[PDB]
Design an enzyme around this catalytic site. Structure first.
Site, PDB file in Angstrom:
ATOM      1  N   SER A  45       0.730  -1.104   0.053  1.00  0.00           N
ATOM      2  CA  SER A  45      -0.181  -0.055   0.005  1.00  0.00           C
ATOM      3  C   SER A  45       0.712   1.286   0.109  1.00  0.00           C
ATOM      4  O   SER A  45       0.278   2.381  -0.317  1.00  0.00           O
ATOM      5  CB  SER A  45      -0.736   0.002   1.282  1.00  0.00           C
ATOM      6  OG  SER A  45      -1.929  -0.988   1.229  1.00  0.00           O
ATOM      7  N   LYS A  48       0.269   3.861  -2.805  1.00  0.00           N
ATOM      8  CA  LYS A  48      -0.726   4.837  -2.780  1.00  0.00           C
ATOM      9  C   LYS A  48      -0.289   6.253  -2.927  1.00  0.00           C
ATOM     10  O   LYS A  48      -0.783   7.164  -3.528  1.00  0.00           O
ATOM     11  CB  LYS A  48      -1.532   4.568  -1.762  1.00  0.00           C
ATOM     12  CG  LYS A  48      -2.349   3.061  -1.968  1.00  0.00           C
ATOM     13  CD  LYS A  48      -3.161   2.615  -0.618  1.00  0.00           C
ATOM     14  CE  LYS A  48      -4.024   1.172  -1.070  1.00  0.00           C
ATOM     15  NZ  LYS A  48      -4.371   0.507   0.096  1.00  0.00           N
ATOM     16  N   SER A 105      -5.672   4.043   3.855  1.00  0.00           N
ATOM     17  CA  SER A 105      -5.359   2.901   3.208  1.00  0.00           C
ATOM     18  C   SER A 105      -6.466   2.165   2.393  1.00  0.00           C
ATOM     19  O   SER A 105      -6.390   0.853   2.055  1.00  0.00           O
ATOM     20  CB  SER A 105      -4.416   2.056   3.688  1.00  0.00           C
ATOM     21  OG  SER A 105      -3.535   1.575   2.930  1.00  0.00           O
ATOM     22  N   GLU A 141      -5.238  -3.724  -6.470  1.00  0.00           N
ATOM     23  CA  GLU A 141      -5.635  -4.080  -4.787  1.00  0.00           C
ATOM     24  C   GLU A 141      -6.448  -5.391  -5.093  1.00  0.00           C
ATOM     25  O   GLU A 141      -7.475  -4.998  -5.708  1.00  0.00           O
ATOM     26  CB  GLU A 141      -5.944  -3.075  -3.799  1.00  0.00           C
ATOM     27  CG  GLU A 141      -4.865  -1.986  -3.379  1.00  0.00           C
ATOM     28  CD  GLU A 141      -4.074  -2.499  -2.437  1.00  0.00           C
ATOM     29  OE1 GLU A 141      -3.123  -1.672  -2.026  1.00  0.00           O
ATOM     30  OE2 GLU A 141      -4.180  -4.065  -2.188  1.00  0.00           O
ATOM     31  N   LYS A 209       3.213   6.882   5.065  1.00  0.00           N
ATOM     32  CA  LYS A 209       2.136   5.672   4.470  1.00  0.00           C
ATOM     33  C   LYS A 209       2.712   4.127   4.961  1.00  0.00           C
ATOM     34  O   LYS A 209       3.905   3.975   4.152  1.00  0.00           O
ATOM     35  CB  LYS A 209       2.201   5.948   2.862  1.00  0.00           C
ATOM     36  CG  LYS A 209       1.181   4.988   2.435  1.00  0.00           C
ATOM     37  CD  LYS A 209      -0.222   5.222   2.525  1.00  0.00           C
ATOM     38  CE  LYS A 209      -1.249   4.199   2.120  1.00  0.00           C
ATOM     39  NZ  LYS A 209      -1.136   3.241   3.393  1.00  0.00           N
ATOM     40  N   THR A 210       1.768   3.350   5.430  1.00  0.00           N
ATOM     41  CA  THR A 210       2.474   2.190   5.848  1.00  0.00           C
ATOM     42  C   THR A 210       1.777   1.232   4.709  1.00  0.00           C
ATOM     43  O   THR A 210       0.916   1.471   3.737  1.00  0.00           O
ATOM     44  CB  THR A 210       1.925   1.816   7.093  1.00  0.00           C
ATOM     45  OG1 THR A 210       0.395   1.664   7.051  1.00  0.00           O
ATOM     46  CG2 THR A 210       2.573   2.437   8.089  1.00  0.00           C
ATOM     47  N   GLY A 211       2.293  -0.058   4.366  1.00  0.00           N
ATOM     48  CA  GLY A 211       1.909  -1.130   3.727  1.00  0.00           C
ATOM     49  C   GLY A 211       2.315  -2.538   4.568  1.00  0.00           C
ATOM     50  O   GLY A 211       3.005  -2.719   5.322  1.00  0.00           O
ATOM     51  N   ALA A 212       1.275  -3.593   4.018  1.00  0.00           N
ATOM     52  CA  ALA A 212       1.352  -4.684   4.688  1.00  0.00           C
ATOM     53  C   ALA A 212       0.800  -5.645   3.462  1.00  0.00           C
ATOM     54  O   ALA A 212      -0.202  -5.311   2.893  1.00  0.00           O
ATOM     55  CB  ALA A 212       0.517  -4.723   6.004  1.00  0.00           C
TER      56      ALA A 212
HETATM   57  O1  LIG Z   1      11.530   4.043  25.495  1.00  0.00           O
HETATM   58  C1  LIG Z   1      12.823   4.106  25.753  1.00  0.00           C
HETATM   59  C2  LIG Z   1      13.328   3.055  24.768  1.00  0.00           C
HETATM   60  O2  LIG Z   1      12.948   3.312  23.498  1.00  0.00           O
HETATM   61  C3  LIG Z   1      13.591   2.398  22.367  1.00  0.00           C
HETATM   62  O3  LIG Z   1      12.623   1.208  22.465  1.00  0.00           O
HETATM   63  C4  LIG Z   1      11.639   1.082  21.659  1.00  0.00           C
HETATM   64  C5  LIG Z   1      12.369   0.116  20.770  1.00  0.00           C
HETATM   65  O4  LIG Z   1      13.386   0.382  20.077  1.00  0.00           O
HETATM   66  C6  LIG Z   1      11.038  -0.415  19.768  1.00  0.00           C
HETATM   67  O5  LIG Z   1      11.545  -1.692  19.172  1.00  0.00           O
HETATM   68  C7  LIG Z   1       9.686  -0.642  20.474  1.00  0.00           C
HETATM   69  O6  LIG Z   1       8.700  -0.916  19.552  1.00  0.00           O
HETATM   70  C8  LIG Z   1       7.435  -0.913  20.315  1.00  0.00           C
HETATM   71  C9  LIG Z   1       6.517  -0.947  18.939  1.00  0.00           C
HETATM   72  C10 LIG Z   1       5.775   0.369  18.627  1.00  0.00           C
HETATM   73  C11 LIG Z   1       5.138   0.161  17.209  1.00  0.00           C
HETATM   74  C12 LIG Z   1       4.839   1.671  16.681  1.00  0.00           C
HETATM   75  C13 LIG Z   1       5.674   2.165  15.110  1.00  0.00           C
HETATM   76  C14 LIG Z   1       5.168   1.114  14.293  1.00  0.00           C
HETATM   77  C15 LIG Z   1       3.678   1.546  13.813  1.00  0.00           C
HETATM   78  C16 LIG Z   1       3.423   0.779  12.300  1.00  0.00           C
HETATM   79  C17 LIG Z   1       4.262   1.000  11.307  1.00  0.00           C
HETATM   80  C18 LIG Z   1       5.670   0.951  11.725  1.00  0.00           C
HETATM   81  C19 LIG Z   1       6.022   1.556  12.960  1.00  0.00           C
HETATM   82  O7  LIG Z   1       9.584   0.673  21.188  1.00  0.00           O
HETATM   83  C20 LIG Z   1      10.452   0.724  22.253  1.00  0.00           C
HETATM   84  C21 LIG Z   1       9.951   1.882  23.292  1.00  0.00           C
HETATM   85  O8  LIG Z   1       8.496   1.480  23.789  1.00  0.00           O
HETATM   86  C22 LIG Z   1      15.039   2.276  22.351  1.00  0.00           C
HETATM   87  O9  LIG Z   1      15.266   1.159  21.472  1.00  0.00           O
HETATM   88  C23 LIG Z   1      15.554   2.021  23.918  1.00  0.00           C
HETATM   89  O10 LIG Z   1      16.784   1.872  24.088  1.00  0.00           O
HETATM   90  C24 LIG Z   1      15.022   3.073  24.945  1.00  0.00           C
HETATM   91  O11 LIG Z   1      15.325   3.067  26.140  1.00  0.00           O
HETATM   92  B1  LIG Z   2      -1.964  -2.353   1.270  1.00  0.00           B
HETATM   93  O1  LIG Z   2      -0.612  -2.657   1.949  1.00  0.00           O
HETATM   94  O2  LIG Z   2      -1.651  -2.691  -0.307  1.00  0.00           O
HETATM   95  C1  LIG Z   2      -3.324  -2.887   1.762  1.00  0.00           C
HETATM   96  C2  LIG Z   2      -3.882  -2.204   2.944  1.00  0.00           C
HETATM   97  N1  LIG Z   2      -3.132  -1.862   4.099  1.00  0.00           N
HETATM   98  C3  LIG Z   2      -2.737  -2.542   5.237  1.00  0.00           C
HETATM   99  C4  LIG Z   2      -1.672  -1.610   5.821  1.00  0.00           C
HETATM  100  C5  LIG Z   2      -1.190  -1.642   7.312  1.00  0.00           C
HETATM  101  O3  LIG Z   2      -1.439  -3.122   7.836  1.00  0.00           O
HETATM  102  O4  LIG Z   2      -0.348  -0.919   7.330  1.00  0.00           O
HETATM  103  N2  LIG Z   2      -1.726  -0.510   5.315  1.00  0.00           N
HETATM  104  N3  LIG Z   2      -2.447  -0.604   4.018  1.00  0.00           N
HETATM  105  N4  LIG Z   2      -2.970  -4.293   2.127  1.00  0.00           N
HETATM  106  C6  LIG Z   2      -4.025  -5.362   2.310  1.00  0.00           C
HETATM  107  O5  LIG Z   2      -5.144  -5.061   1.728  1.00  0.00           O
HETATM  108  C7  LIG Z   2      -3.524  -6.613   2.746  1.00  0.00           C
HETATM  109  C8  LIG Z   2      -3.777  -7.788   1.904  1.00  0.00           C
HETATM  110  C9  LIG Z   2      -2.984  -8.869   1.580  1.00  0.00           C
HETATM  111  C10 LIG Z   2      -3.740  -9.688   0.777  1.00  0.00           C
HETATM  112  C11 LIG Z   2      -5.151  -9.258   0.661  1.00  0.00           C
HETATM  113  S1  LIG Z   2      -5.496  -7.954   1.456  1.00  0.00           S
END
Ligand SMILES: OC[C@H]1O[C@H](O[C@H]2[C@H](O)[C@@H](O)[C@H](OCCCCCCC3CCCCC3)O[C@@H]2CO)[C@H](O)[C@@H](O)[C@@H]1O
Ligand SMILES: *[B]([O])([O])[C]([C]N1[C]=C(C([O])=O)N=N1)[N]C(=O)[C]C1=[C][C]=[C]S1
Ligand SMILES: OC[C@H]1O[C@H](O[C@H]2[C@H](O)[C@@H](O)[C@H](OCCCCCCC3CCCCC3)O[C@@H]2CO)[C@H](O)[C@@H](O)[C@@H]1O
Length: 265
Positions: A45, A48, A105, A141, A209-212
């Site tokens: 995604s 997009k 998305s 899609e 913008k994310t994708g999965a």
């Molecule tokens: O808060 C303090 C800590 O912050 C970081 O830790 C991070 C770590 O590096 C990461 O792996 C995790 O992920 C948790 C998941 C969060 C997901 C949100 C982001 C996503 C969302 C979807 C798209 C991609 C990004 O967070 C922690 C903190 O909480 C440092 O790595 C660590 O040294 C520090 O001491």
């Molecule tokens: B995109 O990545 O093409 C679309 C929608 N989507 C999911 C996210 C996310 O999770 O960050 N962002 N946008 N992906 C899908 O629809 C997933 C599918 C794979 C096979 C059928 S649907």
């Protein structure tokens, strides 16, 4: 956290998949960190944003209007249509479609938009027009998320995607107003933006913008920087990992943490 490249390597080791990563200055295009930057990864995604760049180019040329209302049918909808499923009676404007595609998305919104630019082929032609000779869209899609091992369909490289996003946002290929619109759509992401902000230290800007997809495929294209500035483009793709969605997200975030802790490079 370790340095960015060390953390990227750790994330591969832990995911058993490939990570592809660019960090690029938005204003100049300086590349700061590069890992597998010329290897192919499914866009999912993330395409997009490029799609709506093509739309905006048509608007700039007078061949399209963001106001124009598009009517569509329920049988046109594909899986994951949170906005478009609500507007069968009344339709959506082209700009609303881009907002749905980027900020929610919405898959059907993306497909409707993709028809207006001539399909996967037409979007690929646009990419060639702006000098991206690598990125390709082949499918709609949701088939474009299949992420089959070895399949070049629907792929980019971290380097190509970063360059392309910079071209769309800053190079004056798009009008000032259109550049501003594309950025604002990324700022307004509702899928991951708010969650990302909740874990970022104060002062860090995010637009994204994310994708999965299937087979572990996961990715983000983002603008990030301190002092509330869109200082850098960060592109991260994961492929061919069996890891949970949660752990993929944790690893992407860990790369982010490494960038934040070691920003002055
Ligand atoms: O808060 C303090 C800590 O912050 C970081 O830790 C991070 C770590 O590096 C990461 O792996 C995790 O992920 C948790 C998941 C969060 C997901 C949100 C982001 C996503 C969302 C979807 C798209 C991609 C990004 O967070 C922690 C903190 O909480 C440092 O790595 C660590 O040294 C520090 O001491
Ligand atoms: B995109 O990545 O093409 C679309 C929608 N989507 C999911 C996210 C996310 O999770 O960050 N962002 N946008 N992906 C899908 O629809 C997933 C599918 C794979 C096979 C059928 S649907
Ligand atoms: O010294 C730097 C900072 O170190 C920590 O911040 C942590 C933060 O507490 C944690 O939540 C985050 O996780 C990372 C969340 C990253 C989300 C952005 C994801 C990326 C992914 C690729 C595209 C850009 C966005 O890491 C940072 C850095 O260690 C401290 O908590 C904070 O007070 C301090 O200012």
């Amino acid at each position: 956290s370790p340095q960015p490249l060390e953390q990227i390597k750790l994330s591969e080791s832990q995911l058993s998949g490939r990570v592809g990563m660019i960090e690029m200055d938005l204003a100049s295009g300086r590349t700061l960190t590069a890992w597998r930057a010329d290897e192919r990864f499914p866009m999912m995604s993330t395409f997009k944003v490029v799609l709506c760049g093509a739309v905006l180019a048509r608007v700039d040329a007078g061949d399209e209007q963001l106001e124009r209302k598009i009517h569509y049918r329920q049988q046109d909808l594909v899986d994951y249509s949170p906005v478009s499923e609500k507007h069968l009676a009344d339709g959506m404007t082209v700009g609303e479609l881009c907002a749905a595609a980027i900020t929610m998305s919405d898959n059907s919104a993306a497909n409707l938009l993709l028809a207006t630019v001539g399909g996967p082929a037409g979007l690929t032609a646009f990419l060639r027009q702006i000098g991206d000779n690598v990125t390709r869209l082949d499918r709609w899609e949701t088939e474009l998320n299949e992420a089959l091992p070895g399949d070049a369909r629907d792929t980019t490289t971290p380097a190509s995607m970063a360059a392309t996003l910079r071209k769309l946002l800053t190079s004056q290929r798009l009008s000032a107003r259109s550049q501003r619109q594309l950025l604002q759509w990324m700022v307004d992401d509702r899928v991951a933006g708010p969650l990302i902000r909740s874990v970022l230290p104060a002062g860090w800007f995010i637009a994204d913008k994310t994708g999965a997809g299937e087979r572990g495929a996961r990715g983000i294209v983002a603008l990030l920087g301190p002092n509330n500035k869109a200082e850098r483009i960060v592109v991260i793709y994961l492929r061919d990992t069996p890891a949970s969605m949660a752990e993929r997200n944790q690893q992407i975030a860990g790369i982010g943490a490494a960038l934040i802790e070691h920003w002055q490079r």
